[PDB]
Symmetry: C2
Subunit: 551 residues, 2 copies
């Protein structure tokens, strides 16, 4: 197993800055020595000096643990000799050590942030995996049909909170996806296609699932003693300041943030042109559109994400949560557009009325079922893509790239692990949110399709684990209360689905009827939401003589 | 001034139960003597024995005050020697004395509840007014154009919390009513009648007023140290029990509460028949309808309120707040029906299409302006009624009914005051809520009418005070956090107004256009509410050598 190493620092050494590299190495060693953490130095591949750091003095660690617990007590998160009663878990120990490493000098730490400070040579600080535990976990989850709370608790203990919430949310989603599968099978087998009742049941299911997930999330947050952690604020190391606490004028912030609308219009035009020309080519040729979209989506998605990340970096945010919220909002907008605008133009444009490009295409040289059949590919193809780029090809690429002195195996393992990319949990949230959006606003067109989604989830709950198991390094533990801003996205998708399902039902099978159907669907959704929200709250002497003398 | 009397008990003595009356008198005297409160007995009119009770031992009162403060501290409401730092106010002293008088034996008091227990002879426990302070207050409020926070604070100190919230809410309503007056004057002078823009501004004003009132209510509640008082529960003395804490099966509760729908249908039919026959008589005769409605409204309102109160009494509620909420809900439903159904049938029935009663009326022997002109009377007449039954005629009736031994004036004052009816604050809330509903959902028909409402408020803020000043006895002080369930009624009225204003505008000046207008108005209202809610939230060694040896 591991040699007890608790953290590893890369500290690549450029050739042109040898004196600067030595000075930084000396400064880092001194800073790590003052805080009382034992360190060791070994060899490293590609002009790197891997250094291993672990805690040495138990008294200092216990004092830090007590101080952190008292600080949690002050802020209301939590309501020596107490360590035995409440044992230290690996996640909180790693979090405290990392915070001690990152915290600046003013707060008792030694700030070694790799970007803002003069420490321009360090690039990564990551822990080490437990191969035996990883193998045991993979074997255990591969022989169980359902997952109990013990497995989620073990994941929380060994990895933190964000991973635990992600897995709990995915498990709850898979558990409640069975009902839409049953209703879709029933509707497709008996009712047929474009059933209003199926749309109403889909809306009700979305509402009840969202409310129950909120309740279960609150329950889980209060169970683990983490509820209320989002109340406090964490200072972003990269947050610039211009005057004395650090202050930044809102004028620059709003001026930077108003730049988004140009980019939004530009991406709208860029995606719409491609969508309309693909549709024109398809209606002229009546395999090319599916292949073209499959090839084109990742190339444009990568550049869009890079541009969004750069734009968010240009903006200045005080706390980390605000920056993450902005990034998630931009990511959700871009992904929703690029994953739903094609279906929107195929449904609400092609069907109601069907030339300015058709004539040009002809000079170069209205089947209602188009919504259904295409959707088939638009699920299945996508599914296989989600099982092609995500899992097999990263491992193949890693293997191709891969293809004293008494512990060479450990050094080789560490060197291989260092080059691995850091895991981000936001992508899986995005994928699950888009799955829920598909189910909410488009399952009416193909009631059976929802069933297939269920199967995919039963793989994802394991497959993502494999992604953490091998194809990624151990993420830094963190504390969180909620999944994040994804609740707003889920609510918006549910409302949009309630609007869109009725319109799809009416159009696939004049104007005043459509308006009445939309109004009825929206009001029914609102009433059901109100009723479910109301119901779920209840689940949990002289005086005597004078009185006589009155007569 | 007063002789220091802190509470008065009536204790009427029926002739047929003289022995029982004497036994009850003795028991009450003993119970009041055990708790340590000094008592005195004097004469009383109409076979009554008025008894005056006041606190005697300062140590017991201070201990009770400290115990109550500690109990508040335990429940989170509040965050000897401390009494000097925080002086006792008259309201809290009266509340503590009344609680000591009412609390049963198990909790250290002497329960003298006049209804449930064997104490079947007592009927009232009321304090005494301060005539000099009342005159000074009336004179002060009659010479000021606007009211500062000091007057509201003084009212809170001298009367409690419910009166303070009522006056603050009425003042805020009067302050924000000026903007709709200005917009209505502008629309009537220039735009004309049935303006869509005026309806949109009315909706926006309603939304912003509701949100700002919620924020100001939270601020006021946290300012006076009362916020969170609604969290605790108060046991209702009349709550029956069937098994052992007291428990009551929900089966009886739901069986009793399902009886309401019969009554709702019965009152719907009863009011609708009268409304339709009055409308038929009016359209046949084209002064009788206005006079008939004015005479008929109080007679049917009284019996409806009596029936609702009896029905609520039949139901069993655990806590007092739930019973009050049910009573307010029934009162609001009945009053809204009886005050809006006439206008609803005049607007949404008479105009769109105009016999089954007309032919019968003929055998017995569509002007769009009807909405406007009638509304004139439907305001002004109502206003004069609100200034006829409320103020002048109660005083006239009281004067007509009205028309040792060294303090006969005090005894006469007490005897006159005892017969006065206890003040209820819910009626003024109901009236203000109905005024706001009129402004929200019908000001578009007559933009100028809102202006008149403003004037009425400038009288009510004083007139209601006069009602407390003379025509009523001092209410028992109480502690409350919010105005009550009236917030839900206000929100519902605002939403209904947003729906109704657009429909009125479209109808007074085909179907698909009406549906589109309704949809646009509702969505604009929702978007404005979301934006305002979002905005208002932001208002607030070896290691060195190895490194060198690497080269
Ligand atoms: Ca997948
Ligand atoms: Ca994934
Ligand atoms: Ca009045
Ligand atoms: Ca009044």
């Amino acid at each position: 197993s591991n040699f007890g190493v608790d953290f590893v620092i890369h500290y690549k050494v450029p050739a042109a800055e040898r004196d600067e590299a030595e000075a930084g190495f000396v400064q880092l060693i001194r800073a790590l020595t003052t805080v009382g953490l034992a360190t060791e130095v070994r060899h490293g591949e590609n002009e790197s000096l891997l250094v291993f750091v672990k805690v040495a003095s138990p008294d200092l660690f216990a004092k830090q643990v007590y101080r952190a617990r008292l600080g949690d007590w002050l802020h209301g998160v939590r309501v020596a000799q107490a360590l035995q009663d409440e044992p230290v878990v690996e996640a909180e120990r790693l979090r405290l050590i990392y915070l001690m490493i990152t915290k600046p000098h003013n707060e008792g730490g030694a700030g070694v942030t790799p970007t803002n400070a003069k420490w321009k040579h360090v690039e990564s600080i990551f822990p080490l995996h437990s191969h035996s535990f990883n193998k045991e976990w993979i074997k255990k989850w591969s022989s169980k049909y359902t997952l109990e709370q013990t497995d989620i608790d073990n994941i929380r203990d060994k990895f933190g909170e964000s991973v635990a919430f992600y897995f709990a949310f995915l498990r709850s989603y898979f558990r409640f996806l069975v009902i839409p599968s049953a209703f879709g099978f029933g509707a497709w087998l008996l009712l047929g296609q474009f059933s209003y009742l199926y749309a109403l049941l889909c809306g009700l299911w979305s509402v009840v699932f969202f409310e129950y997930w909120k309740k279960q999330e609150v329950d889980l947050a209060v169970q683990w003693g983490v509820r209320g952690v989002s109340s406090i604020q964490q200072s972003r190391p990269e947050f610039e300041w211009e005057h004395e606490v650090k202050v930044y004028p809102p004028m620059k912030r709003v001026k930077t943030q108003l730049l988004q609308i140009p980019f939004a219009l530009a991406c709208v035009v860029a995606l719409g042109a491609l969508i309309v020309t693909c549709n024109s080519l398809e209606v002229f040729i009546n395999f090319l559109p599916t292949i073209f979209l499959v090839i084109g989506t990742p190339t444009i998605s990568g550049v869009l994400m890079g541009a969004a990340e750069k734009l968010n970096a240009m903006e200045n945010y005080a706390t980390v949560d605000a920056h993450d919220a902005a990034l998630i909002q931009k990511q959700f907008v871009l992904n929703f557009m690029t994953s739903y605008m094609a279906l929107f133009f195929t449904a609400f444009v092609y069907i109601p009325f069907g030339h300015p490009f058709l004539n040009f295409w002809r000079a170069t040289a209205i089947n209602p079922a188009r919504i259904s059949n295409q959707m088939f590919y638009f699920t299945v193809t996508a599914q296989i893509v989600n099982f092609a780029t995500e899992v097999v090809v990263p491992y193949i690429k890693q293997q191709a790239f891969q293809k004293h002195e008494e512990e060479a195996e450990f050094l080789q393992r560490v060197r291989e692990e260092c080059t691995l990319e850091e895991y981000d949990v936001s992508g899986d949230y995005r994928e699950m949110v888009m799955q829920f959006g598909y189910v909410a606003m488009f399952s009416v067109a193909w009631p059976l399709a929802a069933c297939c989604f269920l199967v995919n989830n039963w793989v994802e709950l394991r497959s993502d684990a494999l992604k953490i198991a091998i194809s990624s390094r151990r993420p830094i533990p963190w504390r969180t209360d909620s999944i994040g801003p994804w609740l707003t996205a889920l609510s918006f998708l549910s409302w949009l689905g309630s609007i869109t399902s009725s319109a799809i039902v009416y159009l696939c099978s004049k104007a005043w009827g459509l308006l009445l159907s939309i109004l009825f669907a929206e009001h029914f959704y609102l009433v059901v939401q109100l009723a479910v929200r109301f119901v779920l709250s209840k689940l949990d002497q002289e005086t005597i003589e004078i009185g006589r003398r009155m007569i």
